[PDB]
User: Fold Oxidoreductase, short chain dehydrogenase/reductase family protein from Collinsella aerofaciens ATCC 25986.
Amino acid sequence: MNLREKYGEWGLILGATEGVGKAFCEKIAAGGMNVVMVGRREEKLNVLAGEIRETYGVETKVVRADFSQPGAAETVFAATEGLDMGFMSYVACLHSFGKIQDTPWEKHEAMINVNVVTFLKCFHHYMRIFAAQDRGAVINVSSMTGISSSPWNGQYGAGKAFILKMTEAVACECEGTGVDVEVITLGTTLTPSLLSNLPGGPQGEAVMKIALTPEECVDEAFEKLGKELSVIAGQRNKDSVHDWKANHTEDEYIRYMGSFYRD
Amino acid sequence: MNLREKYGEWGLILGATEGVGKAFCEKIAAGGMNVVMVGRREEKLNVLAGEIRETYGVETKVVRADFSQPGAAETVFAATEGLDMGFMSYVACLHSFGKIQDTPWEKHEAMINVNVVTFLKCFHHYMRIFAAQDRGAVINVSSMTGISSSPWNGQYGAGKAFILKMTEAVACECEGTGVDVEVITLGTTLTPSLLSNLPGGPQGEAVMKIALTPEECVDEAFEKLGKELSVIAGQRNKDSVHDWKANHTEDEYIRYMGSFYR
Ligand SMILES: NC(=O)c1ccc[n+]([C@@H]2O[C@H](COP(=O)([O-])OP(=O)(O)OC[C@H]3O[C@@H](n4cnc5c(N)ncnc54)[C@H](OP(=O)(O)O)[C@@H]3O)[C@@H](O)[C@H]2O)c1
Ligand SMILES: NC(=O)c1ccc[n+]([C@@H]2O[C@H](COP(=O)([O-])OP(=O)(O)OC[C@H]3O[C@@H](n4cnc5c(N)ncnc54)[C@H](OP(=O)(O)O)[C@@H]3O)[C@@H](O)[C@H]2O)c1
Assistant:
């Protein structure tokens, strides 16, 4: 759970405001890092930043940026220049319900920006930094849809797959070096986004009981940092992926993922 | 009065490791029953068994068996010798996408074993036990495809319909006895991968009003045990099946199921 001496003074949470991003901010601060917190809700980030400073006694820097827009990465670069950087996590995602043809191009472009372009610009920039000082850590967040595909939300699984395989490559590249990289692939996790799908009564409560908390996802990711390259958070999600991979065709998995919308 | 007290010491979950089987294990344990958990993934069953014992304070027993293989049922029979049995649930299902001619006989034989032969061997054996002691319960699991049929995966519906109509018959036989039998027919069930493809919504909410968690399926089954013989889990699934049954022909339903493939 220690980060500051091993990796660096400051860690950067790209999509920090709530949910998994907030859990990352608390976790790195508990590990001795000062926190650069990036997100769209500047006021909410300021409130979080104050809680982090109070609870953990580290410094904070709030950066307002929207990863769906061109130049979001470059704004973050400017805001961190001069800091001793030790950690990055790409947490934000964007998805949008619809068949490929039913989603407008401007929405497709936004998803390319959040899940691919902003992602990679950040990953490249901070890897240049970490690799050059031979110390640093990256934990990027992927999704089980990056493994399964996401019918009726296609670009979501696509962009999370890009994150997954780019981070797996880099993780293997960093073994034996002072930089430690990992991708952690989430399933259902108790963030506001998730909670938005849940009807009030037992129809929602049943899901609460099988979802993971953001804290446990983050704790597992740090436990395995530097030892495992590609981790699926929670035993149940790991086992599920293995079962699909070992015992089913690719098409069986894909058709199963379409269950809500077809038969 | 709890399940243990009403039916017996041990329940047997045939296909226990995840999904609806896992939910049956947890549910009977919540009712005070000890759990015999049967499935292929032995180390995963051990983990689950540990969690159940810790959470609910009942005893557990893990049995490794593969219901696609001849001799699987006999392995389970041997494993429960001497236990006071009060419950059984057949949950395991095997299906394999393909037109009939494109699926090899060896896979067809495996499906017969899981959905029909191992199913009936176990149902017969434990009904002979339950009926002799005049005490026990059985909840078997079927699928919507047992109602609709499943073009391009014919044995799924076929096997699920065998389970459905067998269990319905026996459920009628067992009214007026100390054995309580029910079949529950399931639609879309929220398993770990499927859950992670929620749209956010409220398209997400809309999906969740129809799709059930395993826990919800099992809660409804126990709520209706000894009261209803054949249940369709979930209110919206009930509405859908009624609409199909009342306002469409059989061929319209089949052709809807086949309209995804070509
Ligand atoms: N929750 C789940 O069940 C689930 C399931 C599978 C995978 N995941 C993965 O977990 C991660 C978190 O996703 P989540 O949906 O649960 O949200 P989350 O943890 O709340 O995301 C953290 C924060 O990132 C920020 N963010 C989102 N879009 C952004 C943008 N364009 N620019 C800057 N910041 C942005 C949001 O705050 P602002 O609104 O203030 O910007 C959000 O609170 C994703 O990588 C996702 O693929 C989650
Ligand atoms: N829940 C998941 O993570 C998961 C993963 C892959 C696929 N699926 C899909 O979801 C459905 C299966 O759901 P499910 O696994 O969640 O639970 P389920 O249908 O409630 O089945 C309960 C359990 O029965 C066991 N079983 C299946 N075949 C068996 C056999 N031949 N002998 C003995 N036990 C057997 C399986 O565990 P063992 O494998 O340990 O035998 C399975 O977990 C299928 O349509 C499958 O395509 C789900």
About this structure: Chain A touches chain B through 47 residues (CB under 8 Å). The first helix of chain A runs from residue 19 to 30.
